[PDB]
Design an enzyme around this catalytic site. Sequence first.
Site, mmCIF file in Angstrom:
data_model
loop_
_atom_site.group_PDB
_atom_site.id
_atom_site.type_symbol
_atom_site.label_atom_id
_atom_site.label_comp_id
_atom_site.label_asym_id
_atom_site.label_seq_id
_atom_site.Cartn_x
_atom_site.Cartn_y
_atom_site.Cartn_z
ATOM 1 N N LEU A 65 17.637 -35.137 29.992
ATOM 2 C CA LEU A 65 17.029 -35.941 31.040
ATOM 3 C C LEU A 65 17.774 -35.745 32.359
ATOM 4 C CD1 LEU A 65 17.839 -39.742 30.743
ATOM 5 C CD2 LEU A 65 18.989 -38.106 29.300
ATOM 6 N N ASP A 66 17.207 -36.298 33.423
ATOM 7 C CA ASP A 66 17.669 -35.997 34.766
ATOM 8 C C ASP A 66 18.765 -36.965 35.196
ATOM 9 O OD1 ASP A 66 15.850 -33.930 34.846
ATOM 10 O OD2 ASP A 66 14.285 -35.158 35.779
ATOM 11 N N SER A 67 19.305 -36.719 36.395
ATOM 12 C CA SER A 67 20.365 -37.554 36.955
ATOM 13 C C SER A 67 19.869 -38.967 37.215
ATOM 14 C CB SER A 67 20.868 -36.935 38.263
ATOM 15 O OG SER A 67 19.868 -37.008 39.281
ATOM 16 N N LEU A 68 18.602 -39.083 37.615
ATOM 17 C CA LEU A 68 18.040 -40.345 38.077
ATOM 18 C C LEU A 68 17.939 -41.348 36.931
ATOM 19 C CD1 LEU A 68 15.189 -42.109 38.922
ATOM 20 C CD2 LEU A 68 16.924 -41.588 40.646
ATOM 21 N N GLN A 84 19.485 -41.029 34.126
ATOM 22 C CA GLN A 84 20.844 -41.193 33.616
ATOM 23 C C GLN A 84 21.550 -42.340 34.326
ATOM 24 O OE1 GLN A 84 24.859 -41.151 33.195
ATOM 25 N NE2 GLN A 84 24.320 -39.925 34.995
#
Lengths: 102, 176, 68, 87, 459, 128
Positions: D41-44, D46
């Site tokens: 999954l992405d940074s956002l 996360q």
Amino acid sequence: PTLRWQEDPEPEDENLYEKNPDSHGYDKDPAVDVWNMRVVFFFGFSIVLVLGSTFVAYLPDYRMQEWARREAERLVKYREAHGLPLMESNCFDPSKIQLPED
Amino acid sequence: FLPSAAYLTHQQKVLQLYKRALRHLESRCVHRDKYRYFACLLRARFDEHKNEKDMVKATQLLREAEKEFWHGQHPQPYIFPESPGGTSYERYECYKVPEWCLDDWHPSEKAMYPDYFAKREQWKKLRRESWEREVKQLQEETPVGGPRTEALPPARKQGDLPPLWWHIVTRPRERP
Amino acid sequence: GKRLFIIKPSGFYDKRFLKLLRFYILLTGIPVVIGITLINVFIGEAELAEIPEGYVPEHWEYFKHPIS
Amino acid sequence: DAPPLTLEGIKDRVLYVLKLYDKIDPEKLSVNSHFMKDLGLDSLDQVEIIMAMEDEFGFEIPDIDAEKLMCPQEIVDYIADKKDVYE
Amino acid sequence: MLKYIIPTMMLMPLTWLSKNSMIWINTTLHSLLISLTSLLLLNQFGDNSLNFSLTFFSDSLSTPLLILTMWLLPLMLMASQHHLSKENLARKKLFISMLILLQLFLIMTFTATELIFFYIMFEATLVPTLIIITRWGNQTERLNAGLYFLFYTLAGSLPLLVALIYIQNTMGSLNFLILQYWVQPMPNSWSNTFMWLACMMAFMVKMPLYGLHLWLPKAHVEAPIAGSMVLAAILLKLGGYGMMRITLLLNPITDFMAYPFIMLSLWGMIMTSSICLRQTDLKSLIAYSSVSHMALVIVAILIQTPWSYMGATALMIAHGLTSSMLFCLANSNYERVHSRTMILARGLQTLLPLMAAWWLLASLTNLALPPSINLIGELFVVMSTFSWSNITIILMGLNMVITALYSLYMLITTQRGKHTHHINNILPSFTRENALMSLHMLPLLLLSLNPKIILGPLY
Amino acid sequence: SFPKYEPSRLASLPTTLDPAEYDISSETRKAQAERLAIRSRLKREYQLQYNDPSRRGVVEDPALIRWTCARSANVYPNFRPNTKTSLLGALFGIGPLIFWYYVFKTDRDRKEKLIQEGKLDRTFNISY
């Protein structure tokens, strides 16, 4: 390349504890510290301060106080017993005075 | 302004805006289900141009995001009551007695707690023993003459404790 | 076994100073208060006489409590 | 006010609140995990997980740590560094 | 009075021919015997003062101040160690004998029959305090502090002598009662203006007033502890005592010429409360606090109400004890840490646990806690000055507000909020520190319980 | 959507809407690099001079000592008496004194003439 001095690096710091852990105020002669604590907490409080407080707590009547209470009682009883008004003004006799007149 | 770098980065600044917007929308919106709706709306609002390629247009829209954020923030946000700037904010700082003390006593109370002071004595032996040469050689040996970073490398070569560990490990519990 | 360890700074000098202060005030806290109690419970304070005729007074015999 | 917590149980509770999230799998919820390699999954989202940990445990973690948790074991380690839960 | 002076004579070679490790006990015990000896003074009653000798006397203007001096002497000598214990024995004996000589000239100043004798013992008080502060000032501008000190105090205190010799050879002898019982009004002539200006200006130097107030704070922040306490308390309240003496004459012109000095002391009181709101160097905060208190005292003296004089002398005694205490507190902080600033030494709630109560009680005596002598003085001076003018209570109340602010900020700045945890050398509280606390605040609170003594001669 | 936040001497201009940071220069990068290097060297010297077990006394920070000697000692040297400085001194030190002196003369003359008229409430005005 100069120094401008000769002396020791200062202040060599001192610590009053860690050699006599039962220490009151001053230096590390062990008996005389107890002599100090004895003389200041006996001969500074136990013979000075509370005893002087009981001395000054009551003493002769400073500035005539209860003397003036009883004298005020007697003189007001006088001036109310004779009918004349209490605390008459003109505190000296106007016959015992001479004005430089106009 | 940050320890391990000089600038934050662009991704970090987008992330700080995202955190502050999420926190202020929490503080704005009670009942939590309409909040979850509006939070997914905000997530969609960042999804509308998540895949941008123009870096300068992206940072321009980030700037205007800060503009309408500052116009649309919350008055008094929900600070955490454990956080800095909060209701606690070291609430139990009353009992944060520093640990360089506890040895400046009289040996009566040292005799009251004998084992913990003997174990602290061997802690202090463990501090003094491995102190000078190893740690200060790793500090004065491996970096550049200008260190140019705040972080410190551990004792990674072979052996002993990481450098300058005392006032980092030996700290209060923060909730006694 | 449930209790933790706590760090008080130092209680020794505090308790020593306060113990010495109460002990060295109460060392004459007892005889002074009990002595003034014995004076105003034994000896009589005073009464309210007027001037006896042909008798000059002392500079004492003026005061309510006789320690004054 | 301060109940007895533990490292095993706080790992259990962080495991629970990770697994209740939607688009992850309950298969590879390991200690030896990533938020970039395996879960992908992405940074956002996360940092949305980071926000969920702040929602559960009731204290802020800073932005200077928001760069560098990125996996559940380091999350549990940093909360253990905060609350200091040992006998 | 020689029953008080001659044991203070014989206590001077005591310091010489006392042996090692015994000077402390001998001086302390004999000093406290002198404290009882002057507690035996208070025989004064009613009609007038106690007029004792072919020369001497003692007023009730002089009685509590004299008791304050001979009670400060043990506190003087007991504070004055731990910074000269490692120094030499000859210099130690010299310092102790210089303190005893300084006390002796102070008591001679308080037993002043003639104002010439008052002037001689006034500058005799002045001169050895110089030697004390310069030989043990312990900072790099004790030089300039003593220099400014002696030159301001002499240069203000110079024409007072000439005015007193003129009053001598125009109105008979200078015994206080024959200076009284005879004095005629002196009308609006400019000779009276300069004579009033000389006397009052010498004492304005001594108080200090606002226009000459850099005289003071260097001589406190660059002075040893006993020198600073004795300097502050006994010299500034001695100057006020001398004005209370001499102001019985020249009363028709003082309402004509008072209005500049009243204004200067009021606006300088507000400006001094403003300047000690913000500064560092914690020692100087008490110095400008003393400037504020003495400006209030001077307004109280130059208005002429019996209420004003009794509140003035009460504020004198209260601020004397408060400043001696708070100087000892600053000495405690400086003997812990070599800082002299304010922001470096912080915390001190956990560490030094009962020191907090004495910082609190010091800031409450400075706060004018209401049953204390400080509020009695400040309140009755406010009453008398609002009688003197219906509008001047604004400066008095704003003084009280900013005074409470800076004293309580002085409390909550050094002993509130965080221990700086990069210091790790401060030891727990000695018994000597809290012993001097008990020596300060037990007579102050007992006179708070029984204040029938310390009010002025118009009791 | 905002009038761009007028600043003040009281309120703070925040670090987000500068807006001059978003014109990222290489010289600001070098400035932050050198500034972090200076902060790193001072913190490293502080940590090396701090955690020693033989360090009995205080850390002896010359920065605070420098600030105190700037605030106290090095003010009067040096000084150039300006028209601005003398005007500000004479107007904030002596001006209020002469103004409240005028109004105290005013109130005293009115009160003295008022009690000289006899029309004051001194029916009982005992403790002056």
